[PDB]
Write an enzyme that holds these catalytic residues in place. Structure first.
Site, PDB file in Angstrom:
ATOM      1  N   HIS A   3       0.822  -1.209   0.000  1.00 24.98           N
ATOM      2  CA  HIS A   3       0.000   0.000   0.000  1.00 24.98           C
ATOM      3  C   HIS A   3       0.860   1.265   0.000  1.00 24.98           C
ATOM      4  CE1 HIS A   3      -3.218  -2.849   1.044  1.00 24.98           C
ATOM      5  NE2 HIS A   3      -2.533  -3.193   2.100  1.00 24.98           N
ATOM      6  N   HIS A  18       5.587   7.002   6.615  1.00 17.92           N
ATOM      7  CA  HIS A  18       5.312   6.599   5.254  1.00 17.92           C
ATOM      8  C   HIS A  18       4.767   7.808   4.512  1.00 17.92           C
ATOM      9  CE1 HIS A  18       1.502   6.220   7.386  1.00 17.92           C
ATOM     10  NE2 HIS A  18       0.975   6.662   6.255  1.00 17.92           N
ATOM     11  N   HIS A  38       2.036   9.130   1.072  1.00 14.33           N
ATOM     12  CA  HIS A  38       0.999   8.941   0.073  1.00 14.33           C
ATOM     13  C   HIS A  38       1.350   9.870  -1.085  1.00 14.33           C
ATOM     14  CE1 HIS A  38      -1.588   6.992   3.165  1.00 14.33           C
ATOM     15  NE2 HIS A  38      -0.923   7.803   3.974  1.00 14.33           N
ATOM     16  N   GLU A  57      -3.372  13.624   0.927  1.00 15.91           N
ATOM     17  CA  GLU A  57      -4.622  13.177   1.539  1.00 15.91           C
ATOM     18  C   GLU A  57      -5.370  14.396   2.089  1.00 15.91           C
ATOM     19  OE1 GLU A  57      -3.628   9.636   3.964  1.00 15.91           O
ATOM     20  OE2 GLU A  57      -4.470   8.681   2.159  1.00 15.91           O
ATOM     21  N   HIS A  73       3.481  11.074   6.558  1.00 12.08           N
ATOM     22  CA  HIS A  73       2.846  10.795   7.832  1.00 12.08           C
ATOM     23  C   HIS A  73       3.865  10.154   8.788  1.00 12.08           C
ATOM     24  CE1 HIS A  73      -1.299  10.612   5.780  1.00 12.08           C
ATOM     25  NE2 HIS A  73      -0.889  11.839   6.028  1.00 12.08           N
ATOM     26  N   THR A 131      -5.968   6.795   7.798  1.00  9.94           N
ATOM     27  CA  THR A 131      -6.489   7.029   6.459  1.00  9.94           C
ATOM     28  C   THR A 131      -6.497   5.790   5.583  1.00  9.94           C
ATOM     29  OG1 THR A 131      -4.412   7.688   5.459  1.00  9.94           O
ATOM     30  CG2 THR A 131      -5.715   9.436   6.521  1.00  9.94           C
ATOM     31  N   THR A 132      -6.084   4.648   6.133  1.00  8.16           N
ATOM     32  CA  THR A 132      -6.217   3.372   5.480  1.00  8.16           C
ATOM     33  C   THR A 132      -6.995   2.459   6.376  1.00  8.16           C
ATOM     34  OG1 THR A 132      -4.272   2.236   6.295  1.00  8.16           O
ATOM     35  CG2 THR A 132      -3.923   3.592   4.415  1.00  8.16           C
TER      36      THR A 132
END
Ligand SMILES: [C]C1=[C][C]=C([B]([O])([O])[O])[C]=[C]1
Ligand SMILES: [Zn+2]
EC number: 4.2.1.1
Length: 258
Positions: free
Chosen positions: A62, A92, A94, A104, A117, A196-197
């Site tokens: 992911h 990590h 996004h 995000e 994040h 958020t996941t």
């Protein structure tokens, strides 16, 4: 669970397995800068990463996580909206397929190219697993990325990606200094939200820095060469691994500044 970011398994599908996706404190959100109010009750924010001890970098299918040794009192976040002390466990990103998307959170509907994040857990709960059963279990420091000048402090991450191309690969990643990913200013917005996941747990105090960091086009292009798939499977580029903004519901976003 087989969630992802595609048409058939992406954010609009997550609610079937994770009904909390339609909850009252979901993340990310759009930060409407005119509606956010300065909060004089916020204490100074303290990012204390001098003893941060990175261990490993992992492609989890992911994103990729840079993991830290969180067994001792060593890289912590305190102050600001937070009561007590939150220990860094991983960071990590996004990011998008194109420079015009990838973040995000949004700022007055603006999407950045990517979002970092830094994930921390509240030490009063003993471990991350117990922390994610609590409404104040986690604190995530969110940092926007824009494309422009290179970020020298990111290049060691960029350089190791070739060794973790596919889902389930990891590499040793010691002595990485996460201070090299922080902008000059710690001005921020804060609100209560979620992961958020999946599993989308509503346990996060979000601290979103106003100042983005700049990374080069070549740095972000290397992120976009990662794969969602495992080795020996059809290639699916790891791009557009962001959840869009969710309803603000009964929340207020507070500003640390001005
Ligand atoms: C387990 C976990 C940790 C952090 C995040 B995110 O995207 O909210 O930072 C999602 C899931
Ligand atoms: Zn994240």
């Amino acid at each position: 669970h087989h969630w992802g970011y595609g048409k058939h398994n992406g954010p609009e599908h997550w609610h079937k397995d994770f009904p909390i996706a339609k909850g009252e404190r979901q993340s990310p959100v759009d930060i409407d800068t005119h509606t956010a109010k300065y909060d004089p009750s916020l204490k100074p924010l303290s990012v204390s990463y001098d003893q941060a001890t990175s261990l490993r970098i992992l492609n989890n299918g992911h994103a990729f996580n840079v993991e830290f040794d969180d067994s001792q009192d060593k890289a912590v976040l305190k102050g600001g909206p937070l009561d007590g002390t939150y220990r860094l466990i991983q960071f990590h990103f996004h990011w998008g397929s194109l420079d015009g998307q990838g973040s995000e959170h949004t700022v007055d509907k603006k999407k950045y190219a990517a979002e970092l994040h830094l994930v921390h857990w509240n030490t009063k709960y003993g471990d991350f697993g117990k922390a994610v059963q609590q409404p104040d279990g986690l604190a995530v420091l969110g940092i926007f990325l824009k494309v422009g000048s290179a970020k020298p402090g990111l290049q060691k991450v960029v350089d190791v990606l070739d060794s973790i191309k596919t889902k389930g690969k990891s590499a040793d990643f010691t002595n990485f200094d996460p201070r090299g990913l922080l902008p000059e200013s710690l001005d921020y917005w804060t609100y209560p939200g979620s992961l958020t996941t999946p599993p989308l747990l509503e346990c996060v105090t979000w601290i979103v820095l106003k100042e983005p960091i700049s990374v080069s086009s070549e740095q972000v292009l290397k992120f976009r060469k990662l794969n969602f798939n495992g080795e020996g499977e059809p290639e699916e580029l790891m791009v557009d691994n962001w959840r869009p903004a969710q309803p603000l519901k009964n929340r207020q976003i507070k500003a640390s500044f001005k």
